[PDB]
């Protein structure tokens, strides 16, 4: 009854916005969804709760002394009918930046939040690096279906290749598979085709293409999702379209990561990178 | 399922079919209870002579004992003084048990306080508990005097009350002239009757000793009476009546009958009557001191003889016929007052009752347990009635006491069967009534389980219990009766003969089987 | 109502105390505000008693030997130390059991070490080892021995753990050492914790490698019901009628086998939260067995508890739950129609330690009676969190009330009935106020379930409306 | 009961066997085995014997009584957090830091850490 | 409300400077509270006119525990409406000598004695060692501003360097800053420029210079602060200039430690 | 051998009995008992199984061999001081920090602490 999901990608490409809007769209179909913020930025529940920022598990654990005393009700906030939690992170410089994810998922399982009263569970995981904490959901079989937000950017595809390398590494001890690829519009002409080719190289599918819409900013200032701000808008239709094909997704494949050279040749193919030659090197 | 017109309590509600089926399921499914044939085989083995030999080879384990601990007796002694708080230095669990024990027997409020010693007192002693407790108790309940006893916890850690009480007065917790007598009452020495002796000696030594040189013997022309551990309210009243009928001046020391029999009139009297401190100060001026229960008043005898210079007479408990005669004649010689005709008529009525009922009392076998002085007086009265004590048990008896009872049994043809056991508990007595079956038991309510055991073996092996002693929990207002004097002997005789007649009526009630002996006239 | 004069009342009563006692006793008295969810800002509990103020609290030995371990019927419980402790607690609490006393059941018997002066001075553990051998000789059908230590055991220095290990392996039988010395803890409350730990550390994990027990999906274990007057038997029949089968009873009528079979259960039904929350929290952690609190006091709380229990199972159980509610509906409705008119509108002040005060409030309200006062001898602050909503607004709340305080509170409120223990019964009967013993049910009962509500209604009526309460004053007075 | 003592002044951690529940506290166990916990009072009011206790068998944790005297001393040296004070008052569970002269040995395995300095740094 | 702490070696005039400081401050109508964090309990005698103010530590032990202690019995108002608190230490050899500061500061927060619209709170803290409860104001961010009272002597300058090392350790975890170097004169040549040289080595400006005279000692027999004894005196206005320079100090700088030879070179090049 | 596992991720410290010297390492004992030390390689080079080990019975410390692979990984993580390296090379005494996948259980009592994070913070 529960479909554990995770969304990965490079920092600043729109993981939170797309995840919150898709989760808000899911609630319209009567789906019970829970959002777990696995990003140290801790703003992945802003547009659901219409709040400044949700209090993170690390904040209450430190202010109360330990994680044992933490009430589930204080940790889990219900807005729009969908439960919201933020892992948070330790102080920058000490410990592991992904420590909040490890603490939060452990606490949620012990307290009973993860029990199957929800149809969907989503993780907003930072994917700029694959280390302890941020790769813990993959390692500990806590997110069966992974969706990668990727743009037509060299760094965005590089992170997408790195996350797929993490999935195959744990493909023989768990059921973690790659659900699809989300393309967010970087206002790049060849980018929708560029990610289609990347998914074919990786062996997966482009689950959708999200166009850059300025109506998202108008909902972001409101601390609100696009679908509730303007249900009749076409941006809410794309988010609705993304929601249906996420539920209807059945292609959960073990990806085939590509090398650095194959990434570069794929960039030069679509004209973002120019055609390089070996005889024009010294000048 | 309940009918609103006939509501059933636990008995016999759980005798219904649905409850019977539920209990059968519970035990068969999960209990893993031994087979009923095995249970019956083990039960029968416990009623045999080979079990008794195993039973009487016990040293470390004691089962179903017949004694309490010392501070219980100390509280009862302290309750007999006017406007006095019993104060137990130690853990609060003792006081809750002491009060409940006396509440269930007397069906009356029992006032006692603790200083609530805990782990910090275990590590660092309980001096601060004494200081705060003494101040708190005096301010709140306003006693005229506070009597201090000890819990086994305070005895093991070596808390000395003299220094603690003295330091409380010199630091302003209580006024320096407030009377705080104390006694050390270790629960691992003696029993509850010993605690009564300890507390009484400490209260007596607290008032008389520093003033001893001024006192002269016989100046106040009274006789001191020390009752001891007494749980029958009629035993206090009968001693007052007999001495006041003789015109004898007397001072009952530690008489709690007033505080234990307060009237119910919309008001709760926390203190009632009790001996005044004045009578304790004037006590060494008495002609002599009489100890009603000498066998647990030994430490008091040393203080009264040594310090007060009173020649304490050698008297037994005034129980039965012969010993009530000796008590009255000794009192007459000391006070110089003759025994009046009222006490002569009362004695003759007891003899009249003895001859009327001697036919039903002759040759009856009795197994009895209780405090030393109570047991000896009961055995002596049974011999005077022609009854045969068979098993005499005293869990708090010593070798000297056991020798004195044997001499009493030797001087009568009815003590041939009788044997005296000291240090034995009621599990030993259960073996005794199985292998050497008597007709009746005489003891406290703990013997009701022995009667239940004997009935399980069979109706012809059942030994009915007669309730005389302390504590009696399953009957109401039996604490109001008397066991001393001629009046106490009449009440005991009536109980004994009518228990025999009740048992005989039950055995001959079967129509066309045994009811040929169901006589109207007995 | 009238919280202003209750606050004034609390102040006048406390003027007799010294400053040290007055400062502390003020923290333990409060006026009820049902809107409060955190009682720590209104009342303070689980503290040491002030010395010499006639507290009603017991010791840790009472909470362990007398409450938790004593009801277990096929086990032999040793009162280690002097003779006093086991004698005053022998058969003084009524826990109903089905057995042959002295053969396979030993609840009403007093096994003790009877410490003397030589045992206080010279060791004491050699006597314990010898005592265990005699128990095996004379009581061979016993299924375990527990050593309940009294105050001197920890004060002289004794190793009852080693004796339990050495003699337990030698005789192939479970020996449970319990360090329930009375001076440990401030009341009976720590006795429950110590007893629960001994169950967890020596008994509960015995049948771990075993899998020969056939378990159904409807397995439930009763926890925290000690069968006072047959209370647990009344509760068990309703659960059985609902389809559920109960493997274990903790610990009224309990057996050593039921305790060991508890980790093979699908749902732990906790009646007394105070005394058995420690072991149910352990079982949820180790075996993953969920637990919940239920209430079988009166029909309103019994129906609410029965439906909540059925909601944890399939729909066959819920249909069966509707059957037992309909079957017993005319029974308790006839009880209310008979007894509520006589009891309507009368005020009751209740002082019991731990679970009963909050628990009995509903059953009183089922008869039109209003609880003016609720108090606990040894409840913690989590128990007071649970009772503020149950109590009415501007009602008196007390914790570890002294003998002086309770007398003053009663003569100002003037309730129609008081429910407390034996140490308070005879004080308030001299004052002309009807009194019901709320620990022992005044040797009546049971009070749980629908069968116990009829007895409860009859008992309250028989005492409150008794003709004796109109004759306290002499006609010439 | 097995007790493991640990201190920077001790070259090696010392393992001892102790009898639980003795009136002589952990201070008693330390002094028989020559463990140099600083003891500078006989009334339990200084903080010199402050130690850190770790229950190695986390399942076999025994409920105890935090005495009001020890509680106030632990607060006077800043070693009793509010969450641990509430846990002792409600759940009767021991705090992380204890006073050795006031700590009763229980039937479990413990790791006792001290620095050689009195409580309060 | 500004929380300040006066640190320094024992015996350089740490108490009398603080007493006359807040005597001048209350003359401006300000509400100032004094907390004595010295095991010696004479830190408030000259503003209360008392033999020895009862310490919080003495009161708790006498009256059971600190829970039974009342705020009125520990907080006494003096001249100028100044709130006076004294926290003594334990007896020598019995535990940490700094437990008194921890008990008192926690007690004052629990009773809420700070929130009563106070302007200035001053801690007179032993500075011979920086550890235990004496370092507690720096450790727990209790006193944001810190002034060191020092003189032209090795031990006084060594103490100033040690406190600055303590500021650096806890600078990252709270706003505890070095405010200035109060300098008192033992009547030694070239002392004003010597301490200024030490101050600019730290990078923190010196607050004011306090010369020695006998007027403070005539006041000491009275038990009355110089400002209230005779407001027209030379030093009476000099503490006014020191108080005015304190309330209007806008620059707080983290200190940088100075090595032993660096301090020795500083003392030597002054001809001492 | 008695092993006590401790971690902030663990509500209670876990006590286990282990057979000393098994080919299966500390990682074996942890995995059989459900202790969630992060294991992220099969060649012993990632260093994610870093644990802090305390010998509770200091008298019973067993000499062992610190292999060149474990030593180099501990340097790459940074959990190997130069004094501990010299102690292992000269006295064959184990360092404070170990890799659980390369640690052989010995016949003593051990306290094993981990944070749930890979070696290298
Ligand atoms: N669908 C969209 N159309 C236009 N702008 C978007 C869209 N989604 C996100 N953005 C913008 O991108 C910025 C970063 O997105 P965000 O979700 O914060 O990134 P991250 O994936 O790091 O959470 C936001 O300021 C937001 O305004
Ligand atoms: N401004 C000053 N002028 C002259 N003498 C002073 C001055 N300030 C302090 N003193 C003297 O120096 C001594 C310093 O002691 P005091 O300030 O009371 O305690 P502390 O040791 O805390 O500084 C005092 O005895 C005082 O007589
Ligand atoms: S165990 Fe407790 S004092 Fe929960 S020690 Fe006490 S047979 Fe009371 S309110 Mo007697 S926590 Fe049981 C109790 Fe309640 S003995 Fe009985 S009635 S439901
Ligand atoms: S608090 Fe509890 S009940 Fe009290 S002793 Fe201690 S374990 Fe026991 Fe038994 S024997 Fe008598 S009554 Fe006490 S004083 Fe020594
Ligand atoms: S594992 Fe990754 S997130 Fe954790 S400390 Fe190392 S680099 Fe940072
Ligand atoms: S920290 Fe400082 S004040 Fe405390 S004991 Fe050590 S040297 Fe003394
Ligand atoms: S030695 Fe002083 S508190 Fe322990
Ligand atoms: S698991 Fe990778 S080094 Fe041990
Ligand atoms: Fe009565
Ligand atoms: Mg984000
Ligand atoms: Mg000074």
Give a brief description.
This is part of a larger assembly, with two copies of chain A, one copy of chain B (522 residues), one copy of chain C (477 residues), one copy of chain D (121 residues) and one copy of chain F (121 residues). Chain A has 283 residues and is of the alpha/beta class.
Describe this structure as you would to a colleague.
This is part of a larger assembly, with 2 copies of chain A, 1 copy of chain B (522 residues), 1 copy of chain C (477 residues), 1 copy of chain D (121 residues) and 1 copy of chain F (121 residues). With 283 residues, chain A is an alpha/beta fold. Chain A has one domain (1-271). Chain A has 12 helices and 8 strands. In chain A, a hairpin with a 2-residue loop joins strand 3 and strand 4 (82-86). Chain B has 22 helices and 12 strands. Chain B has helices at 10-13, 17-31, 36-45, 49-55, 70-78, 92-106, 119-124, 127-141, 152-156, 161-170, 192-208, 233-245, 277-281, 298-306, 322-335, 341-356, 358-361, 372-384, 399-410, 426-435, 448-457, 485-507, and strands at 62-63, 84-89, 113-114, 145-150, 223-226, 250-252, 288-291, 365-369, 388-394, 419-422, 440-443, 465-467. In chain B, the strands form 3 sheets. In chain B, strands 10-9-8-11-12 form a 5-stranded parallel β-sheet, with helices on both faces. Chain B has a 3-stranded parallel β-sheet with strand order 3-2-4, sandwiched between helices. A 3-stranded parallel β-sheet of chain B has the order 6-5-7, covered by helices on one side. In chain B, helix 19 links the parallel strand 9 (388-394) and strand 10 (419-422). With 121 residues, chain D is an alpha+beta fold. A 5-stranded mixed β-sheet of chain D has the order 2-1-5-3-4, with no helix packed on it. The longest helix of chain D has 10 residues, at 82-91. Chain F has one domain. Chain F contains 3 helices and 5 strands; from the N terminus they run ββαβααββ. Chain F has a 5-stranded mixed β-sheet, with no helix packed on it. The interface between D and E is medium-sized, with 17 and 19 residues. Residues 15-16, 39, 41, 43-44 of chain A line the site of one magnesium ion. Chain B: GO terms for molecular function: ATP binding; iron-sulfur cluster binding; metal ion binding; nitrogenase activity. Chain B: Pfam families: DUF3364, Oxidored_nitro. Chain B: Tetramer of two alpha and two beta chains. Forms complex with the iron protein (nitrogenase component 2).
Detail the topology: elements first, then pairings:
This is part of a larger assembly, with two copies of chain A, one copy of chain B (522 residues), one copy of chain C (477 residues), one copy of chain D (121 residues) and one copy of chain F (121 residues).
Chain B: H1 10-13, H2 17-31, H3 36-45, H4 49-55, E1 62-63, H5 70-78, E2 84-89, H6 92-106, E3 113-114, H7 119-124, H8 127-141, E4 145-150, H9 152-156, H10 161-170, H11 192-208, E5 223-226, H12 233-245, E6 250-252, H13 277-281, E7 288-291, H14 298-306, H15 322-335, H16 341-356, H17 358-361, E8 365-369, H18 372-384, E9 388-394, H19 399-410, E10 419-422, H20 426-435, E11 440-443, H21 448-457, E12 465-467, H22 485-507
Parallel strand pairs in B: 2-3, 2-4, 5-6, 5-7, 8-9, 8-11, 9-10, 11-12
Helix pairs in contact in B: 4-20, 5-11, 8-10, 11-14, 16-22, 18-19
Chain D: E1 2-6, E2 14-17, H1 26-32, E3 50-55, H2 68-76, H3 82-91, E4 97-99, E5 109-113
Parallel strand pairs in D: 1-5
Antiparallel strand pairs in D: 1-2, 3-4, 3-5
Chain F: E1 2-6, E2 14-17, H1 26-32, E3 50-55, H2 68-77, H3 82-91, E4 97-99, E5 109-113
Bound molecules: adenosine-5'-diphosphate (2 copies), iron-sulfur-molybdenum cluster with interstitial carbon, FE(8)-S(7) cluster (CLF), iron/sulfur cluster (2 copies), FE2/S2 (inorganic) cluster (2 copies), fe (iii) ion (FE) and 1 more.
